[PDB]
Design a protein around this motif. Structure first.
Motif, PDB file in Angstrom:
ATOM      1  N   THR A   1       0.829  -1.198   0.000  1.00  0.00           N
ATOM      2  CA  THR A   1       0.000   0.000   0.000  1.00  0.00           C
ATOM      3  C   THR A   1       0.858   1.240   0.000  1.00  0.00           C
ATOM      4  O   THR A   1       1.656   1.430   0.916  1.00  0.00           O
TER       5      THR A   1
ATOM      6  N   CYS B   1       1.247   5.052   0.827  1.00  0.00           N
ATOM      7  CA  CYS B   1       0.644   5.889   1.857  1.00  0.00           C
ATOM      8  C   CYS B   1       0.888   7.390   1.603  1.00  0.00           C
ATOM      9  O   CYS B   1       0.810   7.833   0.471  1.00  0.00           O
TER      10      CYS B   1
ATOM     11  N   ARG C   1      -2.201   8.631  -0.761  1.00  0.00           N
ATOM     12  CA  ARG C   1      -3.373   7.860  -0.333  1.00  0.00           C
ATOM     13  C   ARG C   1      -4.463   8.795   0.188  1.00  0.00           C
ATOM     14  O   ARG C   1      -5.646   8.501   0.093  1.00  0.00           O
ATOM     15  N   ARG C   2      -4.071   9.936   0.721  1.00  0.00           N
ATOM     16  CA  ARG C   2      -5.086  10.899   1.163  1.00  0.00           C
ATOM     17  C   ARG C   2      -5.770  11.640  -0.008  1.00  0.00           C
ATOM     18  O   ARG C   2      -6.476  12.598   0.205  1.00  0.00           O
TER      19      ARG C   2
ATOM     20  N   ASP D   1       5.792   6.564  -0.759  1.00  0.00           N
ATOM     21  CA  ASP D   1       6.040   5.842   0.482  1.00  0.00           C
ATOM     22  C   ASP D   1       5.332   4.481   0.541  1.00  0.00           C
ATOM     23  O   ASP D   1       4.156   4.402   0.843  1.00  0.00           O
TER      24      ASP D   1
ATOM     25  N   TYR E   1      -1.508  -2.676   9.508  1.00  0.00           N
ATOM     26  CA  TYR E   1      -2.474  -1.581   9.476  1.00  0.00           C
ATOM     27  C   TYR E   1      -2.208  -0.531  10.523  1.00  0.00           C
ATOM     28  O   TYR E   1      -2.664   0.608  10.390  1.00  0.00           O
TER      29      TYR E   1
ATOM     30  N   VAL F   1       0.325   1.267   8.242  1.00  0.00           N
ATOM     31  CA  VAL F   1      -0.400   1.936   7.169  1.00  0.00           C
ATOM     32  C   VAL F   1      -1.136   3.201   7.704  1.00  0.00           C
ATOM     33  O   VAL F   1      -0.959   4.308   7.168  1.00  0.00           O
TER      34      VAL F   1
ATOM     35  N   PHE G   1       1.463   5.785   8.431  1.00  0.00           N
ATOM     36  CA  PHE G   1       2.114   6.398   7.271  1.00  0.00           C
ATOM     37  C   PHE G   1       1.191   7.114   6.264  1.00  0.00           C
ATOM     38  O   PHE G   1       1.666   7.834   5.401  1.00  0.00           O
ATOM     39  N   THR G   2      -0.111   6.894   6.370  1.00  0.00           N
ATOM     40  CA  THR G   2      -1.083   7.616   5.560  1.00  0.00           C
ATOM     41  C   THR G   2      -1.208   8.954   6.235  1.00  0.00           C
ATOM     42  O   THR G   2      -1.152  10.006   5.609  1.00  0.00           O
TER      43      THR G   2
ATOM     44  N   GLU H   1       2.757   3.092  15.872  1.00  0.00           N
ATOM     45  CA  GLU H   1       2.915   2.718  14.477  1.00  0.00           C
ATOM     46  C   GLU H   1       3.068   1.193  14.296  1.00  0.00           C
ATOM     47  O   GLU H   1       3.218   0.687  13.191  1.00  0.00           O
TER      48      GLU H   1
ATOM     49  N   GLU I   1      -7.592  -1.356   9.099  1.00  0.00           N
ATOM     50  CA  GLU I   1      -7.696  -0.042   9.700  1.00  0.00           C
ATOM     51  C   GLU I   1      -8.985   0.088  10.528  1.00  0.00           C
ATOM     52  O   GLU I   1      -8.982   0.633  11.632  1.00  0.00           O
TER      53      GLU I   1
ATOM     54  N   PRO J   1      -9.429   8.113   4.292  1.00  0.00           N
ATOM     55  CA  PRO J   1      -8.105   8.709   4.103  1.00  0.00           C
ATOM     56  C   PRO J   1      -8.142  10.155   3.538  1.00  0.00           C
ATOM     57  O   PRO J   1      -7.476  11.054   4.080  1.00  0.00           O
TER      58      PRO J   1
END
Length: 325
Positions: A167, A169, A173-174, A183, A257, A260, A263-264, A286, A307, A321
């Motif tokens: 994934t 991030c 991802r946002r 990343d 998760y 994830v 890092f998101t 984390e 998540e 996100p």
């Protein structure tokens, strides 16, 4: 304000002259120059009427009439610039040069893009590639190119082994329009927080991406974290696509998760969420989410398969996100 430009000019000059110069005597001076001007009830038009004041020597009277004419002062420019501070915090733009090394280079005479481009024997490989692509690493990456970078990495990984989960991030991802870098968080079921420690799970993915010429350089390859340089394929295009920063972290399956989520991010959201967890009696991390017992004694990591699990625990609705500014 009448003068003001003049007094901020003198205050900053006094400060410098005591915390760089160490001539507290002429710091004491500028101080006197500034207090007076601030007392004086009329707007200084020139540095001669400005000289005719009880605490303004003609050296200073020579500056004021200047700042009035140019709207600036060269002595302040050649001071703000060389600021032992401001240099460090510049060299630190170059990937591979932190505080410790920056301080070395700086007070040993090197502090600008060209000073650097004139002594690569003082730099290691990370610092070197980081220099070569300074401007490139300075640009943004359109969501568009990132999608393409997502596809290369994503499919290359699934081809190696379908059990990998990967994934991207960060600002990507946002749902962001523009990113600073890519990343990637990678995990695999054979790798848990109880298991050996398998660096090949990561290495195998990195080398496959170099093999197909996506990754162009390694800055740091660790047991669990790789950071390098990557590039989108092209035609006959001159500078086609610049080189981007890519990071690849490997994480135990059973605490993926957590990584994830983290890092998101958005740090402001991480800050708020952990803080909320800490108020319903959990600590988020984390890596894990743990009950927080009587004192600050954390219990056992809870099972996290997504998540959503993390949200449920602290009694929050799942925040898309895009919605974690």
């Amino acid at each position: 304000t009448l003068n003001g430009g003049i007094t901020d000019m003198l205050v900053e000059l006094a400060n410098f002259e005591k915390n760089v110069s160490q001539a507290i005597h002429k710091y004491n001076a500028y101080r006197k120059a500034a207090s007076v001007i601030a007392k004086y009830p009329h707007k200084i038009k020139s540095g001669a009427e400005a000289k005719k004041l009880p605490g303004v020597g003609t050296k200073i009277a020579e500056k004021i009439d200047e700042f009035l004419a140019t709207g600036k002062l060269r002595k302040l420019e050649k001071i703000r610039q060389d600021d032992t501070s401001s240099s460090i915090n510049f060299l630190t733009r170059v990937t591979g040069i932190g505080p410790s090394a920056a301080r070395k280079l700086v007070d040993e005479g090197i502090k600008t893009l060209e000073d650097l481009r004139k002594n690569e024997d003082k730099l290691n490989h990370h610092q070197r590639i980081g220099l070569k692509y300074f401007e490139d690493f300075e640009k943004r990456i359109p969501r568009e190119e990132m999608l393409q970078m997502q596809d290369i990495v994503l499919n290359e990984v699934k081809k190696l082994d379908p059990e990998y989960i990967a994934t991207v991030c960060g600002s990507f991802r946002r749902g962001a329009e523009s990113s600073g870098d890519m990343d990637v968080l990678l995990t695999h079921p054979n790798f848990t927080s109880e298991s050996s420690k398998q660096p090949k799970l990561l290495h195998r993915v990195v080398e496959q991406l170099q093999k197909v010429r996506f990754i162009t350089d390694t800055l740091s390859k660790g047991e669990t974290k790789f950071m390098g340089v990557c590039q989108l394929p092209s035609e006959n295009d001159e500078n086609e696509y610049p080189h981007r920063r890519i990071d690849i972290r490997l994480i135990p399956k059973d605490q993926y998760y957590c990584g994830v989520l983290y890092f998101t991010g958005s740090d402001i959201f991480n800050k708020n969420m952990r803080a909320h967890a800490l108020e319903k009696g959990f600590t988020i991390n984390e890596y894990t989410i743990r009950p927080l017992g009587v004192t600050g004694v954390a219990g056992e990591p809870l099972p996290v398969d997504s998540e959503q699990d993390i949200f449920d625990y602290i009694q929050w609705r799942y925040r898309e996100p895009k919605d974690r500014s």
